[PDB]
């Protein structure tokens, strides 16, 4: 009983090639840091940058674990131009089930039953349609615009710091603009380090955006025991058959 | 604004070729029925047979909308012989978020925060693991064993009825075993027609098996506002920064 | 459901080419203003000029949404020389209906009914004839004569201000009549800015000129329930038929 995680690790190559299938996580970011006063600040900065970046991709497989439907989510547009709709699976469950309860027979308990169940799956499909938007606008869009916004400024200032530090070192070694560039870089690194009530703001709203789906569709799904309860109450008194209460 | 459903129908070929991708629904069953006393009874029988068959496939895309993970669900075995585990997507979220909250830094609010969030996604992943079993044993397995059980008897008796009806007609036309075969066939058709507290039994348990996921993971997800509420209560009194309540 | 305004925007090219069809609105006017003391005063002046101009054209499609009948309205003349009459559509509704109630039969309820209805449409057509005149003389004619009157003076004074400002600048730059022209221009701009109880005077009369059509033709149209009410009162007592009250 040792291959129980040996070949599970060997199939973990397939599980991490499904991670490599359309680029899911793949590592963390990097290890290399600055000189040892902005060591952990640049570490917190770049791990903050990729921690902002990777959970967008990982929440996109939460919204769409289909391969094609992950390509329809990423664009920020709310119009039809290059983004089709996801085939919602309880919609595809009620789309046949309404016509199946129709063509079953209207004068049975099943005509009063399966039409209600296919209506219930169709009303459940609206929850799967509205699940993919609040993460698209509170976790994909503002973190994406913080990636395509102020993170370019932090990367530009540290890229020019890594250019001007060697200029300062080659100036000060050859005896007989490090300061301003280091100041704007260290200001952006300390702004991403200390002044960081932005990622907890999206995370505390992300857990509530996950949370405000479940009890609503739950308390909708209690109503099918009220709607379908006619057959344990009046169809049990049929002279043809007595059945399950 | 008329192409708004014209090219939506033309992409409905792609949406129904994703139905044709690993065989999702594809029609209903058939139209052809018997002579006009077992017309609607054979209609209810064959539409009952395919109505038992198709929602198994449609609930399998509810359990797994991944293409590979639909192949790992169908077998009734619960061991490891020819069915690997599904890569659960909130497991893949808390599998890197725990090490990211570790390597972020332990002496911050984020060390007390993102470790809690990655723990929350890991405890949410157990719900996605337990979602795929009660439909596998109350909707896949008994409907599958009713397909591979008594439906073979109904199909065999109607197949021999369609053999012996022409024998009776060719016997009674040529002047100068229809009855027993028609009796067992009509008994199986009326047993699938009237005595049918089997599909409502799996449907009323199927809606509760859907239902008993949501409020449980909901009331787990209210506890992260209790666990993460330390930062709107004690970290707001920091002399470095006042932040969001 | 995203093409629901994507192809509505793509047909908005046809809706704005119907704006381009005989020149309906087309933009606002312009953006370019003077130096930053007569910036907003010239903005208010030119937007006032085009705001005087464009609602004349837009009220002309309110009076005549026919394409030919918009060409018959614009000229200020009240005589026949180059302006024919509009084919009024309730006149064209009563023109057949009077001869149709005549040739229907005089000895029926329909002879006492459809002649009354075709008379009602003919008396309704006088309201469509008188709708197109009070906007032609309170919104087309005085705003048009304020366009072809004092607006030429404002445009002439600002055109000579834009000529003499560069003359003042080229005079005062070359060391070793801006004032009078700027005074008459700034007087006309402040007269169109502050002293502007002219466009509210036509607008408050324009909304009443719209308003004094509706209740008059309404309270005419209540009289057809008095004139046509003979058939729910005396024709119901016919021995041939009892009918709708």
From Swiss-Prot, chains A, B, C:
It is found in: Cytoplasm; Golgi apparatus membrane; Mitochondrion outer membrane; Cytoplasmic vesicle, Autophagosome membrane. GO terms for molecular function: cadherin binding; fatty acid binding; identical protein binding; lysophosphatidic acid acyltransferase activity; phosphatidylinositol 3-kinase activator activity; protein homodimerization activity. It is a peripheral membrane protein. Residues 1-33 are annotated as: Required for membrane binding. Keywords: Acetylation, Apoptosis, Autophagy, Coiled coil, Cytoplasm, Cytoplasmic vesicle, Golgi apparatus, Lipid-binding, Membrane, Mitochondrion, Mitochondrion outer membrane, Phosphoprotein, SH3 domain. Residues 23-237 form the BAR domain. Phosphorylated at Thr-141 by CDK5; this phosphorylation is required for autophagy induction in starved neurons and facilitates homodimerization. An N-terminal amphipathic helix, the BAR domain and a second amphipathic helix inserted into helix 1 of the BAR domain (N-BAR domain) induce membrane curvature and bind curved membranes. HeLa cells lacking SH3GLB1 show dissociation of outer and inner mitochondrial membrane as well as abnormal mitochondrial morphology. Cells overexpressing SH3GLB1 lacking an N-terminal amphipathic helix show a similar phenotype. This is Endophilin-B1. It comes from Homo sapiens (Human). The lineage of its organism: Eukaryota, Metazoa, Chordata, Craniata, Vertebrata. The gene is SH3GLB1. The chain holds residues 5 to 269 of 365 of the full protein.
């Amino acid at each position: 009983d040792f291959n129980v995680k040996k070949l599970a690790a060997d199939a973990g190559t397939f599980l991490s090639r499904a991670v490599q299938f359309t680029e899911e996580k793949l590592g963390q970011a990097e290890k290399t840091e600055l000189d040892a006063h902005l060591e952990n600040l640049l570490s917190k900065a770049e791990c903050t940058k990729i921690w902002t970046e990777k959970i967008m991709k990982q929440t996109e497989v939460l919204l769409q674990p289909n391969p094609n439907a992950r390509i329809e989510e990423f664009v920020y547009e709310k119009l039809d131009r290059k983004a089709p709709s996801r085939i919602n699976n309880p919609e595809l469950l009620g789309q046949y089930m309404i016509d199946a309860g129709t063509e079953f027979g209207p004068g049975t308990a099943y005509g009063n039953a399966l039409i209600k169940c296919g209506e219930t799956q169709k009303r459940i499909g609206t929850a799967d349609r509205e699940l993919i938007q609040t993460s698209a606008l509170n976790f994909l869009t503002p973190l994406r615009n913080f990636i395509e916004g102020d993170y370019k400024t932090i990367a530009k200032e540290r890229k020019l710091l890594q250019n001007k530090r060697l200029d300062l070192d080659a100036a000060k070694t050859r005896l007989k603009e490090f300061d301003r560039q280091a100041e704007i870089t260290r200001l952006l690194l300390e702004g991403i380090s200390s002044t960081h009530a932005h990622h907890l703001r999206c995370l505390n709203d992300f857990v509530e955006a996950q949370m405000t789906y479940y009890a609503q569709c739950y308390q909708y799904m209690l109503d099918l025991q009220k709607q379908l309860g006619s057959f344990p109450s009046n169809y049990l008194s049929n002279n043809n058959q007595t059945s399950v209460t």
